[PDB]
Design a protein around this ligand. Structure first.
Ligand SMILES: Nc1nc2c(ncn2[C@@H]2O[C@H](COP(=O)(O)OP(=O)(O)OP(=O)(O)O)[C@@H](O)[C@H]2O)c(=O)[nH]1
Ligand SMILES: Nc1nc2c(ncn2[C@@H]2O[C@H](COP(=O)(O)OP(=O)(O)OP(=O)(O)O)[C@@H](O)[C@H]2O)c(=O)[nH]1
Ligand SMILES: [Ca+2]
Ligand SMILES: [Ca+2]
Ligand SMILES: [Ca+2]
Ligand SMILES: [Ca+2]
Ligand SMILES: [Ca+2]
Lengths: 420, 426
């Protein structure tokens, strides 16, 4: 009746408790919460460290989850790396919030560091029976996966379908290449000192007849999830290289071409040798290619990236840290990284210049970047006012809608490139 | 001859069965084991659920351990929340390890008391015979020490005996009593370290640092006795003592000498958890006739970046009083630039690790140069800590570091000596 490994109640027992909780709810109009907790990227840990460590980490997390709740509450392992939590007898519906953060914050400390995404389903608001509530909380949890990770999300009518949609995309992504469904769009970069074009970024567009245009931000995670990141990443790299190689012949220089590089790709053994090859074929000087690695990966409290990163520098490729400013980071480790560029996350820029918090952190990032001799570029710049603000504050480069949204090669060349 | 409540054999009966086993062990030349099991944080269980439940829990625990062992094996209640176990016949010492874990995993599942089920844990010490002793008392003693070791190296764990374990266990107990006494007899002492400004060259304040000398043990370092306090629940009493005395002295100094900057005091993580902190702090200031502006509370980064929603609201409350807030040991590990701004900080203290390498080390320079730029941008009074050499102070000045603190200025001084060395008349 209890999970042997963790000693926690099983799915069955839980649903018995939830029923009593539901009776309690309708008898004494006292709302409740069902939280679904799934661990962030646990396979990589099982492979990286082996079951021995895994089975242990689960026991540890189990305990720490219990130590965060009251005796009235219930914590169960639902199977796999998934814990379902029952908060009955909430005085107010908003209480589930404070208890959610506690649970999420239990993971901030170490155990070996792991993370988890939480989905909240309130009752009876979001369901009046066990299967429905469990099903919804899960759907919420998936939305936390959808929106980055290591976060909590609430259930909303729509996001049950959004969850099953993402699942569908994973299988279709396998056919993406066979069908001519992948494209590269290009976005210009602007330096504020001068008024000149200083480079561009390649973005991956995936089209599907059922689901329409899929966004790059949502595309890569999917490719990672279904283990196609390598094959797809290679396709993206090569086509980026090809495009730059072509432009070098039919158009005047505008700087380097930028591309997102997934951690999984950084983990490959033949990457550096692969890139050499690709750069040679297109007749490209290595520095003409810029690889963007997202901060959250680099700052996973495990400096496994250094080794490879230096190789890429010895190759001559430019390295940029992407989506910087959010979450946790290490200043010590930030300097040890051979980076040329630091990209300011959109979130902080979208608020410029009105919001003082965003403005405050933008300055901090700007000043931090110059101290560590890194070129600072702001991404998501949407208004002339933001550009002006960033210009005074001494941001070096901008990228976003003020200049141009992503464009197809032809339109991009047509609009921004000159002859030579 | 049996524990009434649990139905388990008491220590007298256990002793005879241990003695008999020892006899067989000598002749037959066979190894054995005595295991000491002490429930983990069971006081909290009684506090939150009450004896009636705790008794049922003990009864439940006792019965589950019984099931985990052979017939030749015997489980006994030594007394309180402590159980003791004997493994008479072992093929080899390796076998004891195996049996120890069995008993651990028995605490994995929760235990059933009335309607509910609660999880309890335990620490386990192991003593082998005749390796670790050939008589009952020393085997129990040594097995107990290992339990205390398991108790100190963490919990819900197992530990084997080692020659040095007994002393460590007693010392830890002694230091507790001595701390408890010192705290209760005002036998701790505050030392004071000056802070200088590089922008001017005049005093900018001072830090109050807790010291503890004991003739029998000598100077007990804070690194040693603060965890002790945290472990045996004396940190709240300690922090309160530190605050009051830190205030008193400053107040007294407000009258006697002239204003020389504010006084900084470290605020342990748990002190922030105190619900009455703000109420209590205000009184402390009022009593000493100290403007809140005169007092600064230093809080370690590692803790503040681990903070919750309850912590940020308090930090505001502390500012509402007018006291200054400072982030201590800054830049070492992983932190959040986003969360750093939302804090109403006034001061930023650069960790001693980055400043002790100045200026020869290239990395430590880059980071120190970064932290200054960071603090400046956020409008935070940046201050170097642990400044030892002149070359280090030089560097910090050419790199725009506002304030400074360390041996280069002066080591922590006793009150009289401080007042006589850095303090001028009202
Ligand atoms: N060590 C251990 N691993 C388990 C256990 N149960 C499930 N897992 C692992 O948990 C992983 C589940 O991964 P998913 O939830 O599919 O995806 P993920 O790798 O966690 O990454 P996300 O998609 O971010 O959740 C699998 O690799 C399982 O082998 C267990 O009892 N012990
Ligand atoms: N209900 C009940 N409680 C008992 C009995 N005997 C001892 N206890 C409790 O067991 C607790 C023993 O606490 P300690 O061993 O001093 O420390 P702890 O709180 O267990 O924490 P540790 O440092 O991990 O041992 C006390 O709070 C006692 O009240 C008993 O017969 N019945
Ligand atoms: Ca998972
Ligand atoms: Ca899962
Ligand atoms: Ca990017
Ligand atoms: Ca105990
Ligand atoms: Ca300090």
């Amino acid at each position: 009746h209890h999970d042997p490994l963790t000693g926690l109640p099983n799915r069955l027992l839980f649903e018995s408790r939830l029923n009593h909780a539901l009776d309690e709810a309708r008898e004494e109009s006292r709302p409740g919460a069902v939280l679904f907790i799934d661990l962030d990227r646990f396979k990589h840990i099982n492979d990286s460290l082996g079951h021995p460590i895994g089975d242990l980490l689960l026991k540890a997390i189990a305990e720490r989850l219990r130590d965060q709740l009251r005796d009235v509450d219930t914590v169960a392992r639902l199977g796999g790396d998934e814990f379902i939590i029952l908060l009955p007898g909430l005085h107010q519906e908003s209480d589930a919030e404070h208890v959610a953060r506690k649970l999420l914050n239990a993971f901030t400390a170490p155990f070996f560091f792991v993370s988890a995404s939480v989905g909240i389903a309130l009752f009876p608001k979001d369901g009046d029976d066990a299967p429905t509530l469990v099903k919804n909380a899960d759907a919420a949890m998936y939305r936390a996966k959808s929106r980055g990770r290591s976060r909590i999300e609430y259930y909303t009518r729509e996001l049950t379908y959004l969850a099953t949609e993402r699942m569908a995309l994973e299988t279709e992504l396998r056919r993406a290449l066979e069908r001519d469904e992948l494209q590269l769009y290009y976005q210009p970069k602007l330096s504020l000192e001068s008024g000149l074009l200083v480079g561009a970024e390649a973005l991956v567009r995936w089209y599907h007849p059922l689901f329409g245009e899929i966004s790059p931000e949502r595309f890569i995670p999917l490719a990672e999830d279904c283990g196609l990141i390598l094959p797809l990443g290679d396709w993206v790299l090569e086509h980026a290289c090809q495009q730059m190689g072509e432009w070098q012949k039919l158009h005047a220089p505008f700087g380097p071409l930028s591309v997102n590089l997934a951690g999984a790709q950084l983990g490959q053994p033949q990457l550096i040798e692969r890139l050499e090859q690709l750069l040679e074929q297109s007749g490209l000087e290595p520095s003409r290619l810029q690889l963007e690695i997202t901060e959250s990966f680099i700052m996973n409290q495990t400096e496994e990236a250094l080794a490879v990163l230096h190789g890429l520098k010895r190759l001559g490729v430019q390295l940029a840290i992407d989506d910087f400013g959010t979450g946790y980071s290490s200043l010590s480790y930030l300097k040890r990284l051979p980076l040329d560029i630091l990209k300011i996350d959109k979130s902080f820029i979208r608020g410029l210049p009105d919001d003082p918090h965003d403005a405050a952190i933008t300055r901090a990032i700007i000043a931090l970047g110059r101290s560590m001799q890194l070129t600072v570029i702001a991404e998501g710049v949407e208004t002339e006012g933001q550009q002006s603000f960033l210009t005074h504050e001494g941001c070096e480069q901008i990228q976003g809608f003020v200049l141009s949204p992503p464009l197809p090669a032809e339109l991009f060349a047509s609009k921004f490139l000159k002859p030579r």
